[PDB]
Write a protein that binds this ligand. Sequence first.
Ligand SMILES: [K+]
Ligand SMILES: [K+]
Ligand SMILES: [K+]
Ligand SMILES: [K+]
Ligand SMILES: [K+]
Ligand SMILES: [K+]
Ligand SMILES: [K+]
Ligand SMILES: [K+]
Ligand SMILES: [K+]
Ligand SMILES: [K+]
Ligand SMILES: [Mg+2]
Ligand SMILES: [Mg+2]
Ligand SMILES: [Mg+2]
Ligand SMILES: [Mg+2]
Ligand SMILES: [Mg+2]
Ligand SMILES: [Mg+2]
Ligand SMILES: [Mg+2]
Ligand SMILES: [Mg+2]
Ligand SMILES: [Mg+2]
Ligand SMILES: [Mg+2]
Ligand SMILES: [Mg+2]
Ligand SMILES: [Mg+2]
Ligand SMILES: [Mg+2]
Ligand SMILES: [Mg+2]
Ligand SMILES: [Mg+2]
Ligand SMILES: [Mg+2]
Ligand SMILES: [Mg+2]
Ligand SMILES: [Mg+2]
Ligand SMILES: [Mg+2]
Ligand SMILES: [Mg+2]
Ligand SMILES: [Mg+2]
Ligand SMILES: [Mg+2]
Ligand SMILES: [Mg+2]
Ligand SMILES: [Mg+2]
Ligand SMILES: [Mg+2]
Lengths: 117, 230, 251, 55
Amino acid sequence: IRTKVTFHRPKTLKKDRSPKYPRVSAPGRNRLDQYAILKYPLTTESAMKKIEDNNTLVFIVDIKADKKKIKDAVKKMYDIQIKKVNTLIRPDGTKKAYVRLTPDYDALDVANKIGII
Amino acid sequence: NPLFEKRPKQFGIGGALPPKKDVTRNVRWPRNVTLQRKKRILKMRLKVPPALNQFTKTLDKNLATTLFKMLLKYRPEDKAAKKERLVKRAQAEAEGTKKPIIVKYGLKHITYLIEQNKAQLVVIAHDVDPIELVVWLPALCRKMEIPYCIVKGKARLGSIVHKKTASALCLTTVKNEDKMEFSRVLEAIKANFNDKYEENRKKWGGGIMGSKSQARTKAKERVLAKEAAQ
Amino acid sequence: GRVIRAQRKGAGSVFKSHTHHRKGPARFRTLDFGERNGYLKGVITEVIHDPGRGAPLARVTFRHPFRYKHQKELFVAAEGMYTGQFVYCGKKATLMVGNVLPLRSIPEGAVVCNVEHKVGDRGVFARCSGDYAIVISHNPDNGTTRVKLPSGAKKIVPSGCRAMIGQVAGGGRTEKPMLKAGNAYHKYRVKRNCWPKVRGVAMNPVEHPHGGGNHQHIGHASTVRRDAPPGQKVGLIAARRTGRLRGQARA
Amino acid sequence: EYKRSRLSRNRRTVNRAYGGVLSGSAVRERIIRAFLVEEQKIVKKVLKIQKAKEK
RNA sequence: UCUAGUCCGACUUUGUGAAAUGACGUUAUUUUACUUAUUCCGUGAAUCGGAAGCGGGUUUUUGGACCCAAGGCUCGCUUCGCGGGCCGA
RNA sequence: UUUAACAGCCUGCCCACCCUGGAAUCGGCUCAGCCGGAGGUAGGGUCCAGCGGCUGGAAGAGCACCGCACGUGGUGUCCGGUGCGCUCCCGGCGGCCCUUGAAAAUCCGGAGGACCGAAUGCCGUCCACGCCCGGUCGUACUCAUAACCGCAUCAG
RNA sequence: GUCGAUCCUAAGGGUCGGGGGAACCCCGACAGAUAGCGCGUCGCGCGUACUCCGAAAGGGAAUCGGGUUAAAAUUCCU
Ligand SMILES: [K+]
Ligand SMILES: [K+]
Ligand SMILES: [K+]
Ligand SMILES: [K+]
Ligand SMILES: [K+]
Ligand SMILES: [K+]
Ligand SMILES: [K+]
Ligand SMILES: [K+]
Ligand SMILES: [K+]
Ligand SMILES: [K+]
Ligand SMILES: [Mg+2]
Ligand SMILES: [Mg+2]
Ligand SMILES: [Mg+2]
Ligand SMILES: [Mg+2]
Ligand SMILES: [Mg+2]
Ligand SMILES: [Mg+2]
Ligand SMILES: [Mg+2]
Ligand SMILES: [Mg+2]
Ligand SMILES: [Mg+2]
Ligand SMILES: [Mg+2]
Ligand SMILES: [Mg+2]
Ligand SMILES: [Mg+2]
Ligand SMILES: [Mg+2]
Ligand SMILES: [Mg+2]
Ligand SMILES: [Mg+2]
Ligand SMILES: [Mg+2]
Ligand SMILES: [Mg+2]
Ligand SMILES: [Mg+2]
Ligand SMILES: [Mg+2]
Ligand SMILES: [Mg+2]
Ligand SMILES: [Mg+2]
Ligand SMILES: [Mg+2]
Ligand SMILES: [Mg+2]
Ligand SMILES: [Mg+2]
Ligand SMILES: [Mg+2]
């Protein structure tokens, strides 16, 4: 018997796709690795003052990189921990990242290792 | 236990909310359900010409079971059975026979057998759609003096021949061991369809109104009848 | 010529009804078993103003016949209705102002409003402020009822049609003069884009049959036939007569 | 600002039936109405039993 | 000199009846009956139709509340606890 | 001649509400209204607003002033009055309409009580405290008698 | 994370199905087996044909002082 005057489509089984062949032969290579994310440090006078005043490293990064990926790229690249990352898109269309290291790390020491100072 | 008590509910207009009720007859069914139900009603509302009305007079249930039981004894071989005999013949051919007695199916093949007068019994499904495929078969069988019957279910006929459906079946000859009971079946079938063919040519079917319409019409004629005696 | 003003209204656009602040359609309950056989009690919760509608509206709450929930309704308020009043709808509802009854149960000479034309259409007749219908007679053989409409016309409706007892509230509205163009502006601001009206004789020929001429005058009979095509049918349409209605004409 | 995480429970509740939804006077009116109306139904029920047996 | 629209008639959609009248078993006209075509109205398609019981000759002083069943009967039961069936309706 | 968000405590406007009590020789009351046996005046309470008060924040800051050196120290930042004043916000009342002057996201509360613990150790907990996390895009500058439009660094 | 966009809906816009249309297109939830949601752990319950677009002045979770640049900040520093 039916207690509802409105007919509802009954639930029916649905299977998950089990393709006989993969549409793509192999996964695509990672196009946003650590080297791709971190293009090069910024060596302007304004950028340099932030190395010691704020313990901050200024990087030019891929425009498609987010703060989450920038944090991991810096960890893999220079083996340093980050307190916070601020990003902006410059008028020339490139992305700049202000990376502040934790007190446990010294930006000036890391800057010398990079080779900008 | 005195703590248990009866808590009756007073139903009616403005009373306690009625419990769940069966509202099946008021369900707003999908389009497909609605059309097939209206299709059934429309057929019986309109007058059915005799050539189409003869298919409502199907074979009786009691005689149908006997006829279908005999058909099961002449089923065509299955796909597995068909392959099994062909390998028995291949070995026989390498190592240096009787005509089968089975039911004939297929409208094209059955019609040929009827025209050639090699058919001894024709079984016709009543639910062939489009009906024009078999609406003429009873006339052909009558003209050829071959007994025929109309049974319910093309699916049932198909199951005999290992097919989803079958419009009609034919028996060109039965095995000699059971030619007596088969002869009796022909007499009953021939007396119900072939003999009544002429009288059924003027029996128009349909014209049946709905239950509410019939009750309303019957009430009106009672007033006329009640006024006839006075 | 160009498309005249009367023709441009049918396209919609700037002539659609102004309905942004309207409270919704005012109508009876959907006809159901309770009203067909017995009666259902409702309670008036508030009497509200509907922009563009002179007659006040009443919000009524009903107990749903078979669902555990409240059933909200919006009725055209009858004169005398008040908040907290019980309103009874159904075949067996008593004859009191505010109740909704089928015409079959309403005696001759009663005053009713919001009368259904078709059984279950929820009311099409006598809905404006101060208007009502009068039950004339019943025809048990045909199952129909005769009622007098506000315009004075007599109409046949099936006896199953429902009607609210009493007249529509807010009567006498049109007696008060507006006195000002601005009052007319506010009136039609919430109805539709039909005010102000420019006279055809003040237009040019391109846009109205009455336009043009070195004097403002129609120049041809303002009475036009019924079958005149759109754009030509202006003025007194299919006028059976004209002039001041004196004598039996103004009855 | 009424969100539970931002406001203590005591500030968004009243310790009474229909607390925070109906005033005290409204609750009092409903309680009396519920009791009196229910009592009247009992009187109606008993009244018709006496007339029912009349036969 | 034409034209959208509009009005009007025929055929078509378009079937089932009856009566009156008329013409040559057919057949026109008129009125009327039927419901399934077609059209329209209503709803979140929620008690329609018929026949029984019951009553006689289910809710109206009140701005409340109202759902997911109490109860009875009856099977299974891995028993005084779960799962079904029929009433309640 | 200064004092932020935020946190706690206090205060309790104009209204609303509660208890006691029972009012004409009527009373109370606003600039205006208006309110009272459907319970006034009066007496005692509750609640609501705050861009109100105190403390924390917070003087360690800021500002002013005077020094010492050419970063560093000191002193002060205090006590009142006034209003048909101006800008903004709020409260409450009244006038006006044949005009009555959006919706939804979201959030809070309520009615109902299926179901659920313990013989006292489990269950429940919108309480306090502690721990972790925080995407993407915009952000410069003009906003006009020279950064907008008018062919221009145009009296528009 | 704290200013906005983003989210919500307004007048309205774009659409499924259906109905039109030689077709470009027209109508726009109106001719229809909606979307799914809730609670247990895959089962029950509910279920009225749009999970769409539409506001940097409507609605709306949360940041305040002090300091800092040649040019940035309720975003940087404390
Ligand atoms: K034109
Ligand atoms: K206008
Ligand atoms: K005018
Ligand atoms: K003229
Ligand atoms: K704040
Ligand atoms: K900025
Ligand atoms: K300028
Ligand atoms: K916005
Ligand atoms: K608003
Ligand atoms: K700060
Ligand atoms: Mg940013
Ligand atoms: Mg005028
Ligand atoms: Mg002119
Ligand atoms: Mg002209
Ligand atoms: Mg009829
Ligand atoms: Mg319909
Ligand atoms: Mg007092
Ligand atoms: Mg302090
Ligand atoms: Mg100081
Ligand atoms: Mg201002
Ligand atoms: Mg509770
Ligand atoms: Mg700026
Ligand atoms: Mg400037
Ligand atoms: Mg400016
Ligand atoms: Mg230009
Ligand atoms: Mg914000
Ligand atoms: Mg809209
Ligand atoms: Mg389009
Ligand atoms: Mg389509
Ligand atoms: Mg719909
Ligand atoms: Mg549906
Ligand atoms: Mg959305
Ligand atoms: Mg949007
Ligand atoms: Mg805004
Ligand atoms: Mg700046």
